[PDB]
């Protein structure tokens, strides 16, 4: 055994040993209990990020722990390959998105393999291969026939200088990001998933997920946004009916979740697209400009509450059906056309947004709720203003004294006898738009024929193959410019027809890949029936918090879609969910002659302050933040592997912080990981250099010295701690410190005797197995030096309960070192000032 720890000498061999034994290439063996542990698969962006290593190390710890516990573990990996980065790279470097993708995949695959993750590479998938995406085209055609996929016109942002569509996140002050040109709103036909049909299913089934962070569950409940409210109709005043037609001349209909405050409405608000706004703006140019500015906006709902709320009065009035009050109609920028009736009522006293709106415009506020004897102040908001639980109505005529629900029912009854309203359930959730005006994505399997209409491609003809021999130019997506692709024959009548040129939202690939891993070479369906029945659902899912809403909701949606098609049998794809934090690093800069800052990478800086590694000209040390190209602070994990080995990388990510926490890049941290691995190596080496391996101590520990009993107590205590940390708590830094404490106590125990060496063998054989999930290369190597059996078949260390039993310490008795003085005095009496450990005072 070499004296010094050298990871490049040991990590290739251990990997070859694991590969040769095929421990991670798993089948559907019904003679072993399955465990499906899955990490969110990456975009083939080019190379691994430190965030990738953190995520996949965590997955590997959990996977190796379950394997060591005798599970049939599947840990699959693959490539979320479609999307914009390949297209941007194609436009910048004059290469095909497919070519750039496959090169990144094969490079990143080598990096993953070098880190020694226990991965079933036989189950690899790449979503940009037709053998993969044909199956989402297939599901598409079936849902299209059932109407779950449908086609309606939608509005998009059109950049006329870049000649493509832009999401709202790419519009700043009404202009495109990479162009600066004013975008135009356009209505184009697009395809949608009728996800709103599954809204109550997707909401209620969240309650089943006892092993998900309640933060994630709560963010999904808020996103679906179900409310039980009330449709209320306010009749248009006779002096306000000019220019209106139909039901819009008779009443303004709104939806509200607080009908118990209808008596407190002091104005109503309407969206810019509403016929009342249209009729009021007919001869008022200030309203026209407000309506245009509202339509010009492109505000994503991640920022539509940050938006300053503005409004304009219309001079039109409506009548409150419960008190007959006349209420002015306002056009407001926060009322969105397409949500409910595109019109709301406002109760400034009991809705904080209404309060602030009424405060800006000096609109009236009428208190109709009271909570205890709390004081109501019309000029400062208070949290209790909005309480529904502990409140009673006031200033509400015959409704006074009622609580929330009884008032709700009383208002529904009053409105329904009058025909002025009725209860209604609403959801914030919108249908899922999937059309993308991009090339590098899965083709939509629809053909347009002027005789037959929008026709799905027959299953016999799937896939619609995306041509890989394309280089995006930047003057529109290429598929619309490629008659060789879109000119085709109608599969229904045989005549001239054109393929859909839009591609699918790339979230679609990642909404079902976890099922595809179960049978990735299955040619007859999305997933084999045999394999879906065996593997069931994912037991453990691990990925970043940035996917808590969209991806997980889509994933749960597709699972219920696939279940309803008869392809799978589970209601929910993900049993346990672990969300990993960010990775941050310090940033560096030198100032600009043009009054700015230029951001230097950490690898090109050396800290004494700090100065460059090139010019030696000092750089300024700045703030710590998420590793990214913005402030050029990403640390390449490849150079960390090059400089220290994979086990160091893995250990450092697991020790620095718990998974949910942000992991700070730390050079002193990495050096500490390496040194502990060096200490682990030397400990085993020094142990063998004195006597060589012996049979590990087992059995009755009577006759062992107090010192060696104490070490066995620490050992099996550490084993139980680590197991509870891997299985339950999923905090891996605490497990590492526990093993470090075990080694500390070993270091201070004389283990030189014969029973001493037997206990030392027991200690070391357990520690290497307890650390194998975090650092399997060095543990595999040291284990072979200690014991000739196969580590993965020796299995997870067992706790020895006997080793936790502590000893036996006008009349004396005997009591355990775990008893207490309540029975120490009950055993002595067979005021008693008990002497814990020497006597007892019978007064
Ligand atoms: C299932 C689908 C939707 C996954 C998708 N292909 C994806 O996000 N693909 S991805 O390639 O972007 O990331 C794959 C996984 O690794 C994590 N990750 C990667 N780079 C990271 C950098 C930092 C910086 O602090 C932090 C984290 N957490 C990072 C990321 O959260 C995700 O769980
Ligand atoms: Mg359950
Ligand atoms: Zn036809």
Using DSSP's 3-state secondary structure scheme, residue 186 falls into strand
Q: Which residues contact 311 (CB under 8 A, 6 or more apart)?
A: 269, 330, 331, 332, 333, 357, 361
- Looking from the CA of residue 45, the nearest atom of ligand 1 is 11
Q: How far apart are CA 326 and CA 316, in angstroms?
A: 10
From the CA of 646, how far away is ligand 1's center (Å)? Answer: 20
What secondary structure letter does DSSP report for 191? E
**Exposed e or buried b for every residue in 568-591, given b needs 16+ CB within 10 A?**
bebebbbbbbbbbbbbbbbbbbee
- Looking from the CA of residue 42, the nearest atom of ligand 1 is 11
Residue with tokens 């209320």: 232
What secondary structure letter does DSSP report for 725? I
Q: Identify the CA nearest to 86 among candidates 95, 77, 75.
A: 95
- DSSP H or E stretch at residue 137: helix 130-145
Distances from the Cα of 706 to the Cα of 714, 749, 756, angstroms: 12, 10, 11
Protein residue whose Cα sits closest to atom 6 of ligand 1: 42
Check if 510 has its Cβ closer than 6 Å to any atom of ligand 1: yes
CA atoms within 13 A on the CB side of 634: 12
Check if 26 has its Cβ closer than 6 Å to any atom of ligand 1: no
Distances from the Cα of 655 to the Cα of 642, 663, 776, 802, angstroms: 20, 9, 15, 31
- DSSP H or E stretch at residue 733: helix 732-747
Distances from the Cα of 805 to the Cα of 702, 716, 764, 818, angstroms: 11, 11, 22, 9
DSSP 571-599: S-SEEEEEEE--EEEEEEEEE-TTS-EEE
Q: Which residues contact 773 (CB under 8 A, 6 or more apart)?
A: 60, 61, 62, 63, 64, 65, 68, 726
Protein residue whose Cα sits closest to atom 20 of ligand 1: 51
Q: How far apart are CA 840 and CA 822, in angstroms?
A: 12
Protein residue whose Cα sits closest to atom 22 of ligand 1: 51
Q: Are 449 and 146 in contact (CB under 8 A)?
A: no
Which ligand is located closest to the Cα atom of residue 448? Answer: 3
Q: Are 357 and 309 in contact (CB under 8 A)?
A: yes
From the CA of 565, how far away is ligand 3's center (Å)? Answer: 28
Check if 547 has its Cβ closer than 6 Å to any atom of ligand 1: yes
To 10 degrees, the CA torsion angle through 321, 325, 330, 332?
A: -60
Query: 310 — phi, psi (to 5°)?
Result: -125, 160
Distances from the Cα of 303 to the Cα of 300, 306, 307, 308, 582, angstroms: 6, 5, 7, 10, 22
Q: Which residues contact 729 (CB under 8 A, 6 or more apart)?
A: none
Beta partners for 254? 232
Q: How far apart are CA 209 and CA 211, in angstroms?
A: 5
Strands 149-159 and 125-126: unpaired
- Angle 443-445-449 (CA atoms, 0-180°, nearest 5)? 120
From the CA of 841, how far away is ligand 3's center (Å)? Answer: 102
Peptide bond into 463 cis (omega under 30): yes
Distances from the Cα of 504 to the Cα of 196, 547, 761, angstroms: 19, 19, 58
Distances from the Cα of 282 to the Cα of 240, 285, 314, 374, angstroms: 13, 8, 10, 46
Measured distance between the N- and C-terminal CA atoms of the chain, rounded to whole angstroms: 67
- Looking from the CA of residue 662, the nearest atom of ligand 1 is 25
Strands 78-79 and 125-126: parallel
- Mutating to test ligand 1, I would choose from 55, 514, 662 the residue with most ligand atoms within 8 A of its C-beta, which is 55
In terms of C-beta density within 10 A (0-12 exposed, 13-18 middle, 19 or more buried), how is residue 217 classed? middle
Distances from the Cα of 42 to the Cα of 55, 389, 438, 472, 618, angstroms: 10, 45, 20, 23, 37
CA atoms within 13 A on the CB side of 689: 10
Q: Which residues contact 401 (CB under 8 A, 6 or more apart)?
A: 392, 393
Q: Are 454 and 507 in contact (CB under 8 A)?
A: no
Check if 42 has its Cβ closer than 6 Å to any atom of ligand 1: yes
Q: Which residues contact 509 (CB under 8 A, 6 or more apart)?
A: 80, 81, 82, 127, 132, 133, 136, 442
Method: X-ray
- Mutating to test ligand 1, I would choose from 37, 47, 51 the residue with most ligand atoms within 8 A of its C-beta, which is 51
Query: 579 — phi, psi (to 5°)?
Result: -105, 125
Q: How far apart are CA 392 and CA 388, in angstroms?
A: 9
Residues at Cβ < 5 Å from ligand 3 ion: 449, 451-452, 490, 492-493
- Mutating to test ligand 1, I would choose from 48, 544, 556, 629 the residue with most ligand atoms within 8 A of its C-beta, which is 544
Q: How far apart are CA 812 and CA 827, in angstroms?
A: 10
The percent helix, strand, coil of the chain (3-state, each to 5) is: 40, 20, 40
* Token pair listed for 106: 């094969």
Protein residue whose Cα sits closest to atom 5 of ligand 1: 42
Check if 580 has its Cβ closer than 6 Å to any atom of ligand 1: yes
Helices (H), ranges, 263-313: 275-280, 285-296
Q: Are 130 and 139 in contact (CB under 8 A)?
A: no
- Give the CATH number, domain containing residue 691: 1.10.730.10
Does residue 147 come out as left (phi exceeding 0), alpha (psi in the -120 to 50 range) or beta? left
From the CA of 396, how far away is ligand 1's center (Å)? Answer: 54
Distances from the Cα of 803 to the Cα of 581, 694, 708, 739, 770, angstroms: 38, 20, 10, 17, 18
Sequence positions preceding breaks in the chain, C–N over 2.5 Å: 608, 809, 830
Domain that holds residue 761: 626-804
Q: How far apart are CA 15 and CA 19, in angstroms?
A: 6
Residue with tokens 């969206």: 271
Check if 627 has its Cβ closer than 6 Å to any atom of ligand 1: yes
Does residue 82 come out as left (phi exceeding 0), alpha (psi in the -120 to 50 range) or beta? beta
CB atoms within 10 A of CB 440: 29
Check if 543 has its Cβ closer than 6 Å to any atom of ligand 1: yes
Resolution to 1 decimal place, in Å: 2.2
Check if 80 has its Cβ closer than 6 Å to any atom of ligand 1: yes
- Angle 329-333-339 (CA atoms, 0-180°, nearest 5)? 85
Check if 57 has its Cβ closer than 6 Å to any atom of ligand 1: no
Q: Identify the CA nearest to 155 among candidates 172, 143, 140, 168.
A: 168
What secondary structure letter does DSSP report for 506? T
Residue with tokens 């054109």: 498
DSSP 304-316: TTTSPP-EEEEEE
N residues, the chain: 843
CA dihedral sign, ordered 168, 170, 173, 176: negative
Protein residue whose Cα sits closest to atom 1 of ligand 1: 40
Q: Are 342 and 336 in contact (CB under 8 A)?
A: yes
Using DSSP's 3-state secondary structure scheme, residue 184 falls into strand
C-alpha gyration radius of the chain: 34
From the CA of 807, how far away is ligand 2's center (Å)? Answer: 42
Beta partners for 449? 453
Q: Are 600 and 589 in contact (CB under 8 A)?
A: yes
Query: 816 — phi, psi (to 5°)?
Result: -70, 160
Q: How far apart are CA 481 and CA 167, in angstroms?
A: 22
Beta partners for 592? none
Query: 163 — phi, psi (to 5°)?
Result: 65, 40
Q: Are 216 and 548 in contact (CB under 8 A)?
A: yes
Q: How far apart are CA 55 and CA 34, in angstroms?
A: 22
Using DSSP's 3-state secondary structure scheme, residue 15 falls into helix
Beta partners for 619? none
Query: 196 — phi, psi (to 5°)?
Result: -60, -25
Q: Identify the CA nearest to 315 among candidates 295, 286, 343, 340.
A: 286
Which ligand is located closest to the Cα atom of residue 489? Answer: 3
Which ligand is located closest to the Cα atom of residue 572? Answer: 2
């Amino acid at each position: 055994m070499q004296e010094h720890y050298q990871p490049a000498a040991i990590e290739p061999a251990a990997q070859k040993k694991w590969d040769d034994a095929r421990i991670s290439n798993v089948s559907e063996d019904a003679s072993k209990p399955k465990y499906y542990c899955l990490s969110m698969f990456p975009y083939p962006s080019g190379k691994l990020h430190m965030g990738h290593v953190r995520n996949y190390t965590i997955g590997d710890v959990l996977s190796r722990f379950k394997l060591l516990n005798g599970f049939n573990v599947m840990q699959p990996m693959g490539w979320d390959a479609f999307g914009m980065p390949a297209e941007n790279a194609a436009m910048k470097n004059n290469v095909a998105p497919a070519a750039w993708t496959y090169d990144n995949i094969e490079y990143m695959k080598t990096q993953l393999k070098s880190l020694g993750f226990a991965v079933d590479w036989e189950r690899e998938v790449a979503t940009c291969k037709p053998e993969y995406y044909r199956w989402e085209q297939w599901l598409f055609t079936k849902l299209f026939e059932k109407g779950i996929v449908y086609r309606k016109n939608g509005t998009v942002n059109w950049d006329p200088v870049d000649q493509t569509v832009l999401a709202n996140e790419q519009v700043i002050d009404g202009r495109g990001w990479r162009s600066g040109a004013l975008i135009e709103k356009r209505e184009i036909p697009m395809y949608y998933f009728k996800i709103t049909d599954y809204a109550e299913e997707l909401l209620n089934d969240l309650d089943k997920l006892e092993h998900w962070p309640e933060q994630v569950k709560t963010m999904q409940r808020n996103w679906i946004g179900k409310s039980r409210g009330m449709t209320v109709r306010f009749a248009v005043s006779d002096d306000s009916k000019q220019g209106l037609e139909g039901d819009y001349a008779k009443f303004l209909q709104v939806y509200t979740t607080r009908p118990d405050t209808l008596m407190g409405a002091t104005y109503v608000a309407v969206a810019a697209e509403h016929p009342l706004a249209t009729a009021a703006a007919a001869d008022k140019p200030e309203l026209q400009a407000f309506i245009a500015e509202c339509k010009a906006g492109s505000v994503a709902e991640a920022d539509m509450a940050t938006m300053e709320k503005k409004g304009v009065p219309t001079g039109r009035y409506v009548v409150n059906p419960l008190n007959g009050d006349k209420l002015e109609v306002w056009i407001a920028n926060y009322v969105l056309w397409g949500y409910g009736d595109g019109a709301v009522m406002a109760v400034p006293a009991h809705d904080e947004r209404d309060f602030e709106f009424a405060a800006k415009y000096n609109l009236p506020k009428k208190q109709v709720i009271a909570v205890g004897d709390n004081a109501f102040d019309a000029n400062r908001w208070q949290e209790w203003y909005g309480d529904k639980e502990n409140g009673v109505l006031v200033n509400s005529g015959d409704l006074d004294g009622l609580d929330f629900q009884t008032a709700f029912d009383a208002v529904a009854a009053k409105l329904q006898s009058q025909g002025a309203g009725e209860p209604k359930t609403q959801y914030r959730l919108r249908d899922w738009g999937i059309s993308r005006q991009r090339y590098w994505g899965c083709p939509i399997p629809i053909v347009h024929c002027e005789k037959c209409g929008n026709v799905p491609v027959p299953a016999d003809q799937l896939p619609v193959v995306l041509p890989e021999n394309v280089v995006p130019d930047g003057m529109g997506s290429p598929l619309a410019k490629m008659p060789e692709f879109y000119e085709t024959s109608c599969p229904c009548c045989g005549g001239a027809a054109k393929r859909e040129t839009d591609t699918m939202d790339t979230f679609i690939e990642s909404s079902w890949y976890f099922f595809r891993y179960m049978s990735p070479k299955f040619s007859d369906g999305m997933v084999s029936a045999e394999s879906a029945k065996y593997w069931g659902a994912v037991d453990q899912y691990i990925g970043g918090i940035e996917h808590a809403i969209l991806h997980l909701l889509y994933a749960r949606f597709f699972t219920k879609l696939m279940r309803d098609e008869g392809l799978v049998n589970v209601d929910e794809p993900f049993e346990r969910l672990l969300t990993q934090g960010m990775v941050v690093c310090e940033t560096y800069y030198r100032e600009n002659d043009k009054g700015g800052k230029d951001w230097i990478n950490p690898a090109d800086v050396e800290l004494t302050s700090a100065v460059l590694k090139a010019d030696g000209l000092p750089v300024v040390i700045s703030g710590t933040e998420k590793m990214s190209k913005s402030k050029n602070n990403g640390v390449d994990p490849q150079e960390l592997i090059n400089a220290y080995g994979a086990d160091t990388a893995r250990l450092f990510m697991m020790f620095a912080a718990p998974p949910e926490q942000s992991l700070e890049w730390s050079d002193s941290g990495v050096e500490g990981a390496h040194r502990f691995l060096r200490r682990l190596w030397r400990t085993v080496y020094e142990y063998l250099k004195q006597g060589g391996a012996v049979k590990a101590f087992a059995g009755n520990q009577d006759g062992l010295s107090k010192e060696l009993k104490d070490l066995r107590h620490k050992l099996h205590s550490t084993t139980a701690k680590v197991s509870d940390d891997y299985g339950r708590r999923q905090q891996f830094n605490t497990a590492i410190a526990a093993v470090m404490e075990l080694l500390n106590q070993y270091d201070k125990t004389d283990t030189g005797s014969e029973q001493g060496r037997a206990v030392a063998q027991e200690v070391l054989e357990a520690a290497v197995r307890l650390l194998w999930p975090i650092v399997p290369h060095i543990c595999e190597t040291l284990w072979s030096e200690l014991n000739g059996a196969k580590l993965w078949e020796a299995g997870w260390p067992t706790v020895d309960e006997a080793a936790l039993v502590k000893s036996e310490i006008r009349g004396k008795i005997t009591v355990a070192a775990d008893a207490s003085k309540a029975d120490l005095e009950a055993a002595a009496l067979a005021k008693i000032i008990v002497v814990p450990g020497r006597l007892v005072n019978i007064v």
